[PDB]
Design a protein around this ligand. Structure first.
Ligand SMILES: [Zn+2]
Lengths: 51, 32, 292, 283
């Protein structure tokens, strides 16, 4: 119960963090970069997180 | 020795009862 | 009463009344207030008072304050920190240090402050051999004090912790009970009025009362210092000053007056070659009158 | 020469309710008013009442239209037992959080010039919810060092919000803790507000309607039990991760059964006990 309450108390400031775009991967390339189509915008050559 | 063990067990039992009551109250108030 | 400050005074009077009595009624009332009240200051005082109530059985305070320390209310977490500190002052409790270590990096600055001060209170005078985390906590205090992007209250707690860990030089310990088993009123009052520094910093100068020298002093028939040398059947490294910051002997000698720790009391002995003898056993400690 | 961080602004229940009601009434605008109170000591600024003033403006600004009203109101309150004089001003920021803008800072500068310790209170109606009210108190920092002296931990317990920090907190103005000290009669009235009439407690409930509700809920529980039987057969042919997303967009028979059980038990127990109590009390 205490964990539930604590999570619901920090969730207010956890919910103001910016979302993340959802894109479609075209093909991996280069050192560690990727080519992604972020609809409705154009494509990007983005990095990849270490994980 | 045996008297000390017996009285220590009695004190432990009383402490366990106190803790049980406190935890039940804490759960009831955590719901609120 | 309806005033939160009056309820807080109620918690404090419970503590002072049932100081060192292990009273189940008082513990029940304190825990009820801690888990029920509407005012966080009252909750904090209620959790804190448990240390005064249970300071004679340090092994039990963790058993009641662990869950409160791991709580959703930072005020109750700070109360648990200070309760452990008061309960296990001058004791180096492994369980207390283990409970306090996770809280030293809590999200809340004043929770960190309370954790640091409680850790210092518990580990006063303790060496590497006696407690295996004193050096770690010393480095933690230095790191917090040196970091330039840390909370000011966390820095306050770290500085106070440095001060408390090395008190009176290194020749003083905090113990709410005398060596004979009586409640030390000056120390109880000092620790209470020091805990009341959340509201007034100048009151921090009350742990001076709680400070109690750790010394075995000899005396002559005329109450004057004799130049005796006591023996401690312990290794030189253990029970020794940490260090001046920039074949192990199995026996050491200490000169009257001697800086002898409460744990060292059990081992201190007098060499029979010397003409002076200790009237009451040296294990008791304190001012001892030496017969000849 | 200090202005300490343990200073607090005591807002009465009446003042808080008036502020919130006026702010909510003026949802798109920054409706505003004056705060009456006393400067007790250097650690208290008691706010005992607030009164709105005739004002007009757009959604980008609001200004007062007559000072004669303010003077006359102060006099006519003193005549009835409120000799307190203005200690600050309050205005509402509807959804922008709590902070001061440039015009707000200019108004607070005028108030500071009049009285040194005057404060500004920003109440945001729409972001306020039942449990919590979003409200803060402010004062300015001169062109200098530290604005205040800390002789306690009381000041550093609020974790200033990112929006206020962006808009100028701790740089052009500093916050003051708000406290809600109450008197015995205020406490008693607030507690008594929700108390219902005694007869309502003993009043029974139409037995036809009660039986109809029981019948409806039992009929629903029948289908819920069918679905519960179906669901229990699952939870073994389910990935440990798939179980969580299994109950997304689909009914949960166990949860609904528990809720219906709770409601039925409460209603029936209450009705039976009330019936017996009435049976004895009324002859
Ligand atoms: Zn504004």
């Amino acid at each position: 119960l205490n964990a539930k309450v604590r999570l619901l108390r920090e969730e207010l400031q956890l919910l103001q963090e910016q979302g993340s775009y959802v894109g479609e991967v075209v093909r991996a390339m280069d050192k560690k970069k990727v080519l992604v189509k972020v609809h409705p915008e154009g494509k990007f050559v983005v990095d990849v997180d270490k994980n | 020795d045996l008297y000390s063990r017996y009285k220590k067990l009695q004190q432990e039992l009383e402490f366990l009862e106190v803790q049980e009551e406190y935890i039940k109250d804490e759960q009831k108030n955590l719901k609120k | 009463d309806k005033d939160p400050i009056l309820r807080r005074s109620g918690m404090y009077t419970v503590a002072m009344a049932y100081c060192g009595s292990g009273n189940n009624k008082a513990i029940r009332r304190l825990l009820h207030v801690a888990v029920s009240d509407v005012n966080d200051d009252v909750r904090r005082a209620a959790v804190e008072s448990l240390g005064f109530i249970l300071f004679r059985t340090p092994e039990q305070c963790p058993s009641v304050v662990s869950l409160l320390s791991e709580s959703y209310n930072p005020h109750v977490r700070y109360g648990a920190a200070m309760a452990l500190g008061i309960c296990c002052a001058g004791t180096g409790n492994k369980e207390a240090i283990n409970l306090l270590e996770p809280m030293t990096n809590d999200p809340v600055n004043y929770v960190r402050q309370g954790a640091l001060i409680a850790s210092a209170l518990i580990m006063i005078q303790q060496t590497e051999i006696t407690c295996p985390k004193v050096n770690q906590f010393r480095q933690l205090y230095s790191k917090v004090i040196n970091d330039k992007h840390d909370d000011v209250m966390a820095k306050f707690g770290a500085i106070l912790a440095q001060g408390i860990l090395d008190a009176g030089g290194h020749n003083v310990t905090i113990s709410l009970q005398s060596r004979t088993g009586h409640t030390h009123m000056p120390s109880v009052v000092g620790v209470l009025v020091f805990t009341q520094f959340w509201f007034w910093f100048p009151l921090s100068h009350f742990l001076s009362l709680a400070y109690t020298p750790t010394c075995v002093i000899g005396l002559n028939k005329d109450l004057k210092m004799p130049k005796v040398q006591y023996k401690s059947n312990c290794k030189p490294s253990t029970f020794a000053y940490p260090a001046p910051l920039e074949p192990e002997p199995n026996f050491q000698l200490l000169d009257n007056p001697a800086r002898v720790m409460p744990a060292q009391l059990k081992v201190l002995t007098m060499p029979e070659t010397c003409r002076y003898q200790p009237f009451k056993p040296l294990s008791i400690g304190g001012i001892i009158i030496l017969k000849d | 020469p200090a202005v300490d961080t343990a200073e607090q602004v005591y807002i009465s229940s009446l003042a808080l309710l008036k502020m919130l009601k006026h702010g909510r009434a003026g949802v798109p605008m920054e409706v505003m008013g004056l705060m009456l109170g006393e400067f007790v000591d250097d650690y208290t600024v008691r706010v005992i009442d607030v009164f709105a003033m005739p004002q007009s403006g757009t959604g980008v600004s609001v200004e007062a239209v007559d000072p004669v009203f303010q003077a006359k109101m102060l006099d006519m309150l003193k005549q009835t037992g409120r000799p307190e004089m203005v200690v600050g001003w309050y205005h509402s920021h509807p959804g922008f959080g709590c902070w001061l803008s440039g015009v707000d800072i200019n108004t607070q500068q005028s108030f500071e010039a009049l009285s040194e310790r005057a404060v500004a209170v920003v109440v945001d109606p729409i972001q306020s919810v039942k449990g919590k009210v979003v409200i803060d108190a402010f004062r300015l920092i001169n062109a200098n060092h530290e604005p205040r002296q800390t002789t306690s931990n009381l000041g550093h317990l609020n974790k200033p919000s990112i929006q206020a920090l962006i808009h100028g907190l701790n740089r052009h103005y500093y916050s003051i803790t708000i406290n809600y000290r109450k008197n015995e009669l205020e406490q008693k009235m607030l507690l008594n507000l929700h108390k219902k009439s005694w007869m309502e407690g003993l009043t029974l409930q139409d037995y036809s309607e009660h039986c109809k509700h029981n019948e409806s809920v039992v009929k629903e529980m029948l289908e819920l039990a069918k679905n519960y039987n179906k669901a229990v057969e699952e939870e073994d042919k389910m990935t440990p991760e798939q179980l969580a997303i299994k109950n997304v967009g689909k009914q949960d028979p166990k949860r609904h059964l528990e809720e219906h059980v709770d409601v039925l038990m409460t209603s029936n127990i209450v009705q039976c006990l009330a019936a017996m109590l009435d049976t004895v009390v009324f002859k």
